[PDB]
Design a protein around this ligand. Sequence first.
Ligand SMILES: N[C@@H](CCC(=O)O)C(=O)O
Length: 418
Amino acid sequence: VEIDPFEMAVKQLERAAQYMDISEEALEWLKKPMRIVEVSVPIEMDDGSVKVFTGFRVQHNWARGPTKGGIRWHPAETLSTVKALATWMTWKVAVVDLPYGGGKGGIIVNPKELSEREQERLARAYIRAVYDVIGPWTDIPAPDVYTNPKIMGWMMDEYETIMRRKGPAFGVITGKPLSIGGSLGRGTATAQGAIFTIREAAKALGIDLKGKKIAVQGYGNAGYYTAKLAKEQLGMTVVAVSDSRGGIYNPDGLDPDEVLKWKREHGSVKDFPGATNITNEELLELEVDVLAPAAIEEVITEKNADNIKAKIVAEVANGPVTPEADDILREKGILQIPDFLCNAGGVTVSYFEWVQNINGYYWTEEEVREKLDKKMTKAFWEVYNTHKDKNIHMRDAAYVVAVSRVYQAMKDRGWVKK
Ligand SMILES: N[C@@H](CCC(=O)O)C(=O)O
């Protein structure tokens, strides 16, 4: 009825665990976050009043290392959502082999109605409230929905003020501006990882992407950068893009820069010059070789699963495919890249930023790109090898890999004896 996010995450975990040999005690440990912190966030309003907000900080598991995750400023943010996202972040950092755990934060607030001063006060108060459970080697927050690098800089400054500069205060939080412990390649991290996964999938399927067609659903940051990087690096033809308002179809190809400029000038991609106007419900079924949903979740359902014609479906967004759609697409011979494997580039570049901050030495764009390429290629090939050995779904193989790594880390620490 309500389909609670945490229940769905636990159900997914059980489905995954049924495909591998894991002890009952370890599964019960994994079903519950290891630490949940709920705090009040009082700030001073611009009119002089004091408003109290509810903040969350869930650390699902830290067997493999310090927990990692973003902070969401959404009016419809709940504890369940934070717990489910921390659980998913655990597997996200485990599949791509990072020395990280799972974490997530969130404040129930509408940031659209907050001023800059009030936003800074909210960030500083959240840091003051959750200081006792965060740190460079304990919990590293990150940008997420309705949060940008400016809030990251404010949060890092507040943490440094509280910590009295007794250590690497830069590394307590990632996604910061380049002037203060920032990292090169952060803006295009997720799309770069998605492009690397798409290239590896094409390599696995034996099809060259040069001259091929790609359709991207959702033209936000991730969708725009995915289309642009595909067109440049992969040599593919961006045939169709879309947003919430509508979509664009052009067999001859779309220039991502031109489409982004049009969207910026008119607020939407609708009615692009010299292009056919469509919507998402027929965009998802266009004849393409790579489809990259980079928008609101749950766009592929059993209704439209049988009509998908893409050879590769790169789940850039967070869970855009339902399990029934997963089964239907696997039956059709379509190679799916799991959601928490395709967009693992953002957390990988976040890890690179944390390493740079901890070490005090900062890398270049080429070094970050090469390291990200190596990490994403290795993770995808491990997942595909499991998918080829166990004769299971790609999402199932990614779950097996991540849960196996976490379980091995737990067994090594002695947390679970079986
Ligand atoms: N928010 C992104 C995916 C999640 C992420 O960026 O980490 C989208 O829905 O397009």
